[PDB]
Amino acid sequence: MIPQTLTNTNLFIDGVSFAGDVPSLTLPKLAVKTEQYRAGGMDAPVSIDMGLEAMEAKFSTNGARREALNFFGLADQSAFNGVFRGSFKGQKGASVPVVATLRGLLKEVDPGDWKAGEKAEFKYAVAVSYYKLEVDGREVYEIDPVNGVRAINGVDQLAGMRNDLGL
Amino acid sequence: IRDDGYRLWGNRTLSSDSKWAFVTRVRTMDLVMDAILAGHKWAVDRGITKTYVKDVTEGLRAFMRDLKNQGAVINFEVYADPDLNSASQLAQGKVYWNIRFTDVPPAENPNFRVEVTDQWLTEVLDVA
């Protein structure tokens, strides 16, 4: 392979670009909910899946930025839309985009300490109700809890439970 | 037949088919469905979801064990037709079911085989 690393990030909240004031992004940690399964005739657990964990995407701005402050605590959950973008560089110069469109509830706004000479950072966190990760313009993840979809290469892994539940 | 015109007597209908000889057979099949239909009027609306065909069978079986309970049938059989439920049929709104049952037979001809014996001529009428 080629040594490849992120060099640049961007954020689109509602189509508006945050191309001056987002120092840090955080994509949601996709964790499956394992239960360590030890049963008869075996000495070690085996970790069956039980569904996904709850996803939170957090991000920080350090200006005022009403274009992200006005999405806190709306009555409409899953109305914060948002696109986390990253450019992964690579040694040969072939920049690969990593774009994570996501949707949910902006669940906490954390204006930190305001010291005078120190940079003040508004920390936000969203409660992700839809998540699609595209790498090099190709769908890697697509997670929609309601309308239960877990696509991993465009392949919906939950077609098994969908016919079982009659969904 | 009797007693200043007292009782209606026959129970054969005017059919040329021995499968449909009794009016019991004709009336039961006619009014098992009129209870099935008037009772499943929700199946002509209610656009086809995934468990549409399952919720009709368990609805058909439920309004058919009420008929086995009161004695109209004996051991019905209801199931969705596996060979004719296509998706080309389902785009037209057609979906099929099979509602086999057995009707109760009328006791048309009780037969008495009566015999006069001299077997109990010694068991009684004797010093013993």
Side-chain angles (χ1 to χ4, degrees), chain A residues 43-74:
Chain A
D43 59 343
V46 81
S47 292
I48 310 299
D49 292 339
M50 305 297 288
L52 287 178
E53 292 288 331
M55 299 181 290
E56 60 182 1
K58 62 177 71 68
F59 67 100
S60 67
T61 185
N62 53 9
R65 274 82 188 88
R66 290 179 62 248
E67 295 293 324
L69 288 173
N70 289 123
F71 290 97
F72 176 76
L74 297 176

Side-chain angles (χ1 to χ4, degrees), chain A residues 162 167, chain B residues 50-51:
Chain A
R162 187 183 298 276
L167 292 174
Chain B
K50 291 187 181 182
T51 59

Side-chain angles (χ1 to χ4, degrees), chain A residues 83-94:
Chain A
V83 176
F84 291 4
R85 284 176 182 263
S87 177
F88 291 12
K89 182 65 180 293
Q91 189 185 4
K92 299 292 186 181

